Design a protein around this ligand. Structure first.
Ligand SMILES: Cc1cc(/C=C/C#N)cc(C)c1Nc1ccnc(Nc2ccc(C#N)cc2)n1
Ligand SMILES: Cn1ncc(C(=O)O)c1-c1ccccc1
Ligand SMILES: [Mg+2]
Lengths: 556, 412
């Protein structure tokens, strides 16, 4: 015998207050029982499970299933109840690597470690909770009782415990061989390197020898699995990567389900196919949530779809990460709240692409959206590469300086340079910091009856210009904006506007360039046409002439 | 030695807080730091049967070139029991904020000398992530009192008291106050004398069993406030008077007897914003009466130690920031303004992060706890960047203001 090192068990507990499962084993056909007895006899000989006495009070149901197109049976132990009762574990499989963060490798070898998985020992004190029962022929003897000695397939803790155990075994090999990478996925180890090929295979043999110390055997035959690897919806090649084939179906009519699937594919595709858009197609999923409902595609959605088909006409690949070079991220505005981006190191060789969509909200502007997109790409890049890329943005340096210095919030974007690629993000208006000499002063107000929704909006000016308009289906807040609109509409190129509307100020001080409100949009269009606008706020009902005059006019 | 038993509050599990993305330089720094800590027995590797997590990152304190591990125990601290067993409580010293100099020491390293209760260790789990999640995150827990944890100064308190005993007895007028990993040491000595006493104090700690060498110097007796003040002008435009009436209206929520009747009457008619308006005598009297009211303290203002402190900050432009700390609206306990610089002349978010730290420091010195911030910044911008500029060993709580406050005008 060659001594092997035992794998240390991970101590396991049920959730506080909970006991183990006690679930009835339902009858099986005579055929299934003979099959299970045979299966379990082999497992028992291999040390995976053990017969137990009548004292153990727990139970998990066992089943026998036909794979398909065979005479063979397989055992299935249904651990659903035990899983509900088993403690949570640390899950490492959360956060899978992005292909764009990987490094190119000359060689990648796959090693089968299937013998390891079904051979990690289970915490002795926990084994009792895994008890199951093969029913007896004709139910005339006690059913055969077994419990697990190893991590059972389908039990809550098996993946975490297998991963942690394998990692611990591999750790010294990885540490003392910094010229290879090792990655564990399901049943296999993947080993990559840039070594001269003879040296690479030597490393593989050394790894096999290392694993042998725990009794882990790997098949003598060299793996059939070789690059390219189909993995987590990607294709990995030695020196490039892509998403698995994206094929958009032809359909004469589309349902909720079809569109959700369309968008999923588009979203998946957008990490390497530049320019993918999903705004119009996503709009069709607004509300709804009735799966079989057919929705007509708007002309807009049709155009978006056709634009995507073109983008997806031929394969595109990303390159891997070279740590010795800067990462560069470039962003374009696409319209309707949509932004697209590319991250590269060498010109014309993307590591990945992506998109960002405007957050829901009544009012917004391009600079805020660009800023949000920058933060999102920054955070993604920290995840993937551990560093912020240098940005190329379609906004002039002077425009940014004016924006951030005058904006009421703190705001920042990291190191960036202007790229002159239309459409450029710009400031559409900026309000005056001081009242304008020689500009007419409009005192505005509005009011509405909250019952009838009848209102009035209007203004009076220092030149005696006046206007009041009677309105239906309005509200006090809406009349306040309506009044400001009228003052903008009726004034010359420079204008001072005095309002008591905290609501209106709150919106305008937010500097929107676009809004869901047609009225706010019209106000924005008016501001864009002015040379100078000063907006002054006063408290309501304070005897502030101009303001009180117009408040009275618009009241009733 | 021989642990103090600790528990979480009843009916709550340990923290399960996601580790946020770390830069390569911070990951490398943390790997190096934790390898050493593990060798020294301060932390140990843990297994998958521990599902808890608390975020970790790394900072560089003021005037230092080496990384410091910073654990964000905000969640664990909420979930940890309050400590009333060994001690009844330690009243906050009102004299600390009165000293000519207060120096802040990092004494967190002393905590590592006391073992952490074996049954509690699991709740201190943390992860060093890998770039692109290519290798499993490195999982550890503490074996000793961790820096940043609420329980550490509480459990180390009897040890700290013995250490400082001969320094306190020898220097009876020096105020020493401990908050988390910080020790605050105040004196009225000349700066050179003060400095030698600090170094004197350090040696006591160095003498015992072992960023301590550092010193963050404050001068709370010079700290200033912002009363409400009104312009003094020889000519008032319609606009100036509107601004005045608006500021007074706002002030009248804080101060009872403020009047604007007479001033509001000045603009009678619908006048050009830039037209100059002479003040009437009635309006002048009213303004004068208002000025006098504003020179008095606000009525019914008191600190309640059972209530949160709230801190609001406004961006005033040109690197200027105003702030107010309060518990009830319009009852400000402290107001202030930083017109200052440091770095960050082209970086709003660095400026704001420095402001948050200075305000938190003031809060600790005055009331012995941190305020809950209302920050004038989008959540995503703050969350992406604040850790890059953080230099303190504690972290306060914060929320985000998305609507521009109209009152920024009046703190300007
Ligand atoms: C995440 C990962 C998945 C697989 C495989 C998963 C599967 N199936 C294989 C490996 C070796 C890794 N780990 C790493 C780590 C750093 N660089 C790389 N680069 C890299 C990996 C594969 C190919 C190829 N062909 C090229 C480069 N891989
Ligand atoms: C110009 N515009 N655009 C939308 C609206 C509206 O009331 O919704 C208006 C408006 C209508 C009446 C008075 C003022 C504005
Ligand atoms: Mg009104």
């Amino acid at each position: 015998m060659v001594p092997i090192s035992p794998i240390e068990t991970v101590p396991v507990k049920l959730k506080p207050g909970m006991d183990g499962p006690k679930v009835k084993q339902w009858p099986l056909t005579e055929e299934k029982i003979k099959a299970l007895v045979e299966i379990c006899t082999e497992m028992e000989k291999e040390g995976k499970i053990s017969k137990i006495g009548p004292e153990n009070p727990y139970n998990t149901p066992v089943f026998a299933i036909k794979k398909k197109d065979s005479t063979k049976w397989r055992k299935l132990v249904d651990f659903r109840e035990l899983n509900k009762r088993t403690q949570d574990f640390w899950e490492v499989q959360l956060g899978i690597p992005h292909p764009a963060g990987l490094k190119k490798k000359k060689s990648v070898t796959v090693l089968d470690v299937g013998d390891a998985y079904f051979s990690v020992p289970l915490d002795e004190d926990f084994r009792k909770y895994t008890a199951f029962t093969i029913p007896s022929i004709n139910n005339e003897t006690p059913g055969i009782r077994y419990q697990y000695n190893v991590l059972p397939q389908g039990w809550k803790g098996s993946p975490a415990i297998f991963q942690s155990s394998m990692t611990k075994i591999l750790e010294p090999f990885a540490a003392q061989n910094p010229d290879i990478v090792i990655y564990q996925y399901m049943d296999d180890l993947y080993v990559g390197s840039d070594l001269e090929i003879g040296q690479h295979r030597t490393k593989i043999e050394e790894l096999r020898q290392h694993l042998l110390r725990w009794g882990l055997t790997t098949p003598d035959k060299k793996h059939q699995k070789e690059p390219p690897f189909l993995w987590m919806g990607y294709e990995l090649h030695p020196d490039k990567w892509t998403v698995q084939p994206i094929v958009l179906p032809e359909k004469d009519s589309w349902t909720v389900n079809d569109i959700q699937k369309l968008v999923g594919k588009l979203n998946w595709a957008s990490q390497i196919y530049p320019g993918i858009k999903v705004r119009q197609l996503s709009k069709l999923l607004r509300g709804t949530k009735a799966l079989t409902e057919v929705i007509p595609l708007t002309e807009e959605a049709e155009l978006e779809l056709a634009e995507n088909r073109e983008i997806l006409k031929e394969p595109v690949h990303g390159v891997y990460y070279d740590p010795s070079k800067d990462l560069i991220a470039e962003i374009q505005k696409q319209g309707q709240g949509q932004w697209t981006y590319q991250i590269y190191q060498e010109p014309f060789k993307n590591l990945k692409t992506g998109k960002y969509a405007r957050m829901r909200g009544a009012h917004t502007n391009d600079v805020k959206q660009l800023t949000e997109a920058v933060q999102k790409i920054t955070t993604e890049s920290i995840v993937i590469w551990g560093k912020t890329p240098k940005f190329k943005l379609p906004i002039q340096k002077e425009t940014w300086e004016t924006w951030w210095t005058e904006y009421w919030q703190a705001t920042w974007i990291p190191e960036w340079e202007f790229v002159n690629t239309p459409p450029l993000v710009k400031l559409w208006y900026q309000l005056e910091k001081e009242p304008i000499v020689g500009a007419e002063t409009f005192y505005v107000d509005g009011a509405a009856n909250r019952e009838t929704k009848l209102g009035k909006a209007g203004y009076v000016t220092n030149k005696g210009r006046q206007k009041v308009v009677p309105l239906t289906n309005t509200t006090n807040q809406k009349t306040e904006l309506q009044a400001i609109y009228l003052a903008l509409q009726d004034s010359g190129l420079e204008v001072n506007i005095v309002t008591d509307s905290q609501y209106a100020l709150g919106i305008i001080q937010a500097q929107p360039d676009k809004s869901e409100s047609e009225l706010v949009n019209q106000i924005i269009e008016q501001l864009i046409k002015k040379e100078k606008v000063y907006l002054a706020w006063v408290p309501a009902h304070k005897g502030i002439g101009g303001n009180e005059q117009v408040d009275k006019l618009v009241s009733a | 030695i021989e642990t103090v038993p600790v528990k979480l509050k009843p009916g709550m599990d340990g923290p399960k807080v996601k580790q946020w993305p770390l830069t390569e330089e911070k990951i490398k720094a943390l790997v190096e730091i934790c390898t050493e800590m593990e060798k020294e027995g301060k932390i140990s590797k843990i297994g998958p049967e521990n599902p808890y997590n608390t975020p970790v990152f790394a900072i560089k304190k003021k005037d230092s070139t080496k990384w410091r591990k910073l654990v964000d125990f905000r969640e664990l601290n909420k979930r940890t029991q309050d400590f009333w067993e060994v001690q009844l409580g330690i009243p906050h010293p009102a004299g600390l904020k009165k000293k000519k100099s207060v120096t802040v020491l990092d004494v967190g390293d002393a905590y590592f000398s006391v073992p952490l209760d074996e049954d509690f260790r699991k709740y201190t789990a943390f992860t060093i992530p890998s770039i692109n999640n290519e290798t499993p995150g490195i999982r550890y827990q503490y074996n000793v009192l961790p820096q940043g944890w609420k329980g550490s100064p509480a459990i180390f308190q009897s040890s700290m008291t013995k250490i400082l005993e001969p320094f306190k007895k020898q220097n009876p007028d020096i105020v020493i106050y401990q908050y988390m990993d910080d020790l605050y040491v105040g004196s009225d000595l000349e700066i050179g004398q003060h400095r030698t006493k600090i170094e004197e104090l350090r040696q006591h700690l160095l003498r015992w069993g072992l960023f301590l060498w550092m010193g963050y110097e404050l001068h709370p007796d010079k700290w200033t406030v912002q009363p409400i003040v009104l312009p003094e002008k020889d000519s008032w435009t319609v606009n100036d008077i509107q601004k005045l009436v608006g500021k007074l209206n706002w002030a009248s929520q804080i101060y009872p007897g403020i009047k604007v009747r007479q001033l509001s009457k000045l603009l009678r008619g619908t006048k050009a914003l830039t037209e100059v308006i002479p003040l009437t005598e009635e309006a002048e009297l009213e303004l004068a009466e208002n000025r006098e009211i504003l020179k008095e303290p606000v009525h019914g203002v008191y600190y309640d130690p059972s209530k949160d402190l709230i801190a609001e900050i406004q961006k005033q432009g040109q690197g200027q920031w105003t702030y107010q700390i309060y518990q009830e609206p319009f009852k400000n306990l402290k107001t202030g303004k930083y017109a200052r610089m440091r770095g960050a002349h082209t970086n709003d978010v660095k400026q704001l992060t420095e402001a948050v730290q200075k305000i938190t420091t003031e809060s600790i010195v005055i009331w012995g706890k941190t305020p809950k911030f209302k920050l004038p910044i989008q959540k995503e911008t703050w969350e992406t960047w604040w850790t890059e500029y953080w230099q303190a060993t504690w972290i306060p709580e914060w929320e985000f203001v998305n609507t521009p406050p109209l009152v920024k005008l009046w703190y300007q």
